[PDB]
UniProtKB/Swiss-Prot annotation, chain B:
Family label: Belongs to the peptidase M20 family.
Native source species: Escherichia coli (strain K12)
Protein name as it appears in the record: Allantoate amidohydrolase
Ranges that cross the membrane: none
Cofactor(s), by name: Zn(2+)
Molecular-function GO terms, alphabetical: allantoate deiminase activity; manganese ion binding; protein homodimerization activity; zinc ion binding
Amino acid sequence: LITHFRQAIEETLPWLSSFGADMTRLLYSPEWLETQQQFKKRMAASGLETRFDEVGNLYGRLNGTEYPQEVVLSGSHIDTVVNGGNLDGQFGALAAWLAIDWLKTQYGAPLRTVEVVAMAEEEGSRFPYVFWGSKNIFGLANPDDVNSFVDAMKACGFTLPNAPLTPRQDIKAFVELHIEQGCVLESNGQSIGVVNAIVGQRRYTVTLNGESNHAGTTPMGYRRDTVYAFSRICHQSVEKAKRMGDPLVLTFGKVEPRPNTVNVVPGKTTFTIDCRHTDAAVLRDFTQQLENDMRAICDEMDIGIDIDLWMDEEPVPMNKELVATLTELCEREKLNYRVMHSGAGHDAQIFAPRVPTCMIFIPSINGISHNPAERTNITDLAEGVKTLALMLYQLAWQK
Amino acid sequence: LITHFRQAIEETLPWLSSFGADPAGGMTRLLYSPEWLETQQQFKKRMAASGLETRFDEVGNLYGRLNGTEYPQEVVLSGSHIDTVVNGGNLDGQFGALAAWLAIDWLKTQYGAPLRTVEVVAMAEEEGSRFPYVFWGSKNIFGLANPMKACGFTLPNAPLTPRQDIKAFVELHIEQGCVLESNGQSIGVVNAIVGQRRYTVTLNGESNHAGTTPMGYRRDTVYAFSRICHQSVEKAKRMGDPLVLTFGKVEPRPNTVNVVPGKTTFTIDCRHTDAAVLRDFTQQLENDMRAICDEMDIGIDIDLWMDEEPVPMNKELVATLTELCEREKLNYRVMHSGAGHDAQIFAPRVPTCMIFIPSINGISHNPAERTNITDLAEGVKTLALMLYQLAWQK
């Protein structure tokens, strides 16, 4: 079976992957449109009832025999970052079509409707808006939020309405298969990850203001080094972070000292912070423990600071029943899995609070993603498509 | 006498500091091309407007000599760079050449021709902010500058002959710092010039997604830096003055909020008066850095590009100035020069010393410079005294 999908992937991945090379493919672009048409074409061919909604999401739908009004959804976004890979997103939609097609031509029609979905867009590429696909599905969009977006959208045969769409309410389940984008699975030697939650995020822009002096003619006790200060903050905080241990992650990815010259004591320093955790309390209590440590450190060496918490998003937990059922099949079907979480946001996070959802991770070699070097061993892709085939069966082909 | 010079400066300094004023803020003289030349001309006039045998040399320095009876071939030089940076100046360099002239003038008219020849100089550039060269003025003076025309000068076909007549050089500067200032002191007896060291350490870790990659699997090149700065600094701090350690330039990569930086190139600037103490500290740092990285599996790359040894001032020239500060109830302050001046390329050839005037809030080079008008007069005074003790002394 894994050998069966390995062929299936091996012959379909390069196919769909051929729509937007140099992999790009952004929201409402020619490639975007063409890609959706070639998928819808083949989806239709294989026996599915394809369609687009007002925003451009693409659907499969193999109608169920007993609960046609109950949909067990599966898919991922089809747009990529400029020079990203062909596995992030795009693959999860492919997988969904492949599992369903095999199940279709194997146990016959489901006893409740199954539906593949190639969502419009996730991870904001082209326009200043993210999740224009999964958000419209639940009417969270509001056209009054968005090269004219309307023109791009209209060029592809779409028109943003004058108000939010009607939130779908026939979705009984949603499962997203996504590459990890990390290195936990690859490192631990595991193939499938049962993600029980999606991390929450906080992001800051903190400015340090001391005094820019001479590096030689200024004694060390007359100084107000803003880069020494940052060092103290970063060094000291990351300690507390690691002590806290997983799933907590902390970053100081960007730093801008001014003037930024060897023989001048930096007087100002604008730096950032990226903290993520699966528990909103741990996340908030911690980031605030940090905010206190920083200003404590600054009132002390007489440096003024501005803390700007511009991004603050709450964690989102995958559905418990669906996770169990998964894990149970990752057992009932002897597999090499690891119940883990997601340090990245996905379309599955928009689904979760509305309909029960769960994700399935496949390793990512070198945690590369949103980069042309992202790959995954094909038999691992096969595993992920096989694990997704097995699950959808549990949800739609079983009463 | 302080409020005598206080009127001299208050009169001379405002008009002298006018040639090359920047309406955009501060002062911009800068080497050779116009605005600099005009200044070298009017400072030659008021010089010639005295028994000063004003002249130039092969590249552009300006002199003014008060020939003396008995040892007229022994020169006592005084002055400082006439150039300045894009914005600011006003007291940097310039005030040294102006003090020397007002100190010689007053002294010469109020004491007649000296034993040894006294000389004032307005050297052409130092710390130059226009072309990739520094000390082009004093270097040529001692034939050290291995090879303008629009200003009327043709650079030599070979290194000029070294001056072999300067009996003692004395440079009066603005400290460019805040030590004298924050001590309620006016004079500084520069005993030595700090011997700088500068590195360009490059850190190579690994860029990773800020959330999908766990903490144990990371190789943060900014966490690395944070550990290296906050460790070495608390070290320099306890080593105590006059040691100074400074990480002024950092540059992580990709250096964006949600990507762990997999590379960070930072800089180091460590200074100290004793060469042995400098070397030792900075040697240990390299060890500390090299240890912290090999620990968190990050590759370093320590590039030590500037390795300058300390330039002490003539020990004798320093005692005569210190006792000079004794006879007079002078509020001096024996200290070291945290920066380099023309006096550092003189010192190794002719006995030399430096007098320090307190400075702003350490503010220097930029237009916000200023030293209390009565502290300046104190300087031009003590300079006038010392020179008297070197060309008029029996």
